[PDB]
RNA sequence: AGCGAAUUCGCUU
RNA sequence: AGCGAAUUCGCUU
């Protein structure tokens, strides 16, 4: 049975106006990164008019366009794709035919990003992963490029249901020795040692300002829980204590649009 | 919001 | 005890 491949085109057609950017966020147009999402089906999708999803960066115009048709894929590849589909929905969005990542081939043309899919699996299988065994002899090294397009997860808590953040900002003028915002501790270093028995090997590293990855399911329409949402983004994280998720933030922002997009496609 | 914990209250004739 | 409902409190830096 032959396959159809669609590109979910995303373009930030109306960026958020400054007078609505209350949380003072940087705006990330999807068209600035080549990697994106696509749909693999066994039957065609009828022509569907361009429509808006309303995201944190503003209004993004969605278009479904055919990339490829009449090809076959091996059992193995179909299996892999099926796994990543499920991964995207269960593990990234946490929800309850195939969505898959596209990218440009070395030459403008979008195709199935197999290498990325294999990288995710490798990461998940704990294959090809750098050390997190930091000591005085082999200390944590902060690399600014690894915290550009990053989603991060504090390792040291919530083993069951890890919370996820975009790096909102890198505070180059803070370090683990900076003063802690709560009186009961003098520094970040003291906090994590006291609260979690975590040692730090790099005391000059920047700290991170975060912004929680959303959960807002329906983006087809525009715009206790008050105390939390407040405090939530006031958190400041230490790089050495946080994992970088194998999914880049650029793609994560596109992924949270999927449920609205698939909802619209089912009509 | 979520996960915990306590307190008060409502239902059976 | 079970099922509801409200009130107070605790956790993330």
Swiss-Prot record:
Changing residue 191 to A: 10-fold decrease in activity. Transmembrane segments: none annotated. It is found in: Cytoplasm; Cytoplasm, Perinuclear region. Residues 115-246 form the PAZ domain. It is linked to Pleuropulmonary blastoma: A rare pediatric intrathoracic neoplasm. The tumor arises from the lung, pleura, or both, and appears to be purely mesenchymal in phenotype. It lacks malignant epithelial elements, a feature that distinguishes it from the classic adult-type pulmonary blastoma. It arises during fetal lung development and is often part of an inherited cancer syndrome. The tumor contain both epithelial and mesenchymal cells. Early in tumorigenesis, cysts form in lung airspaces, and these cysts are lined with benign-appearing epithelium. Goiter multinodular 1, with or without Sertoli-Leydig cell tumors: A common disorder characterized by nodular overgrowth of the thyroid gland. Some individuals may also develop Sertoli-Leydig cell tumors, usually of the ovary. Belongs to the helicase family. Dicer subfamily. Component of the RISC loading complex (RLC), or micro-RNA (miRNA) loading complex (miRLC), which is composed of DICER1, AGO2 and TARBP2; DICER1 and TARBP2 are required to process precursor miRNAs (pre-miRNAs) to mature miRNAs and then load them onto AGO2. Note that the trimeric RLC/miRLC is also referred to as RISC. Interacts with DHX9, AGO1, PIWIL1 and PRKRA. Associates with the 60S ribosome. Interacts with BCDIN3D. Interacts with AGO2, TARBP2, EIF6, MOV10 and RPL7A (60S ribosome subunit); they form a large RNA-induced silencing complex (RISC). (Microbial infection) Interacts with ebolavirus transcriptional activator VP30; this interaction prevents TARBP2/TRBP binding to DICER1 and thus allows the virus to counteract host RNA silencing. Double-stranded RNA (dsRNA) endoribonuclease playing a central role in short dsRNA-mediated post-transcriptional gene silencing. Cleaves naturally occurring long dsRNAs and short hairpin pre-microRNAs (miRNA) into fragments of twenty-one to twenty-three nucleotides with 3' overhang of two nucleotides, producing respectively short interfering RNAs (siRNA) and mature microRNAs. SiRNAs and miRNAs serve as guide to direct the RNA-induced silencing complex (RISC) to complementary RNAs to degrade them or prevent their translation. This is Endoribonuclease Dicer. It comes from Homo sapiens (Human). The lineage of its organism: Eukaryota, Metazoa, Chordata, Craniata, Vertebrata. The chain holds residues 766 to 1063 of 1922 of the full protein.
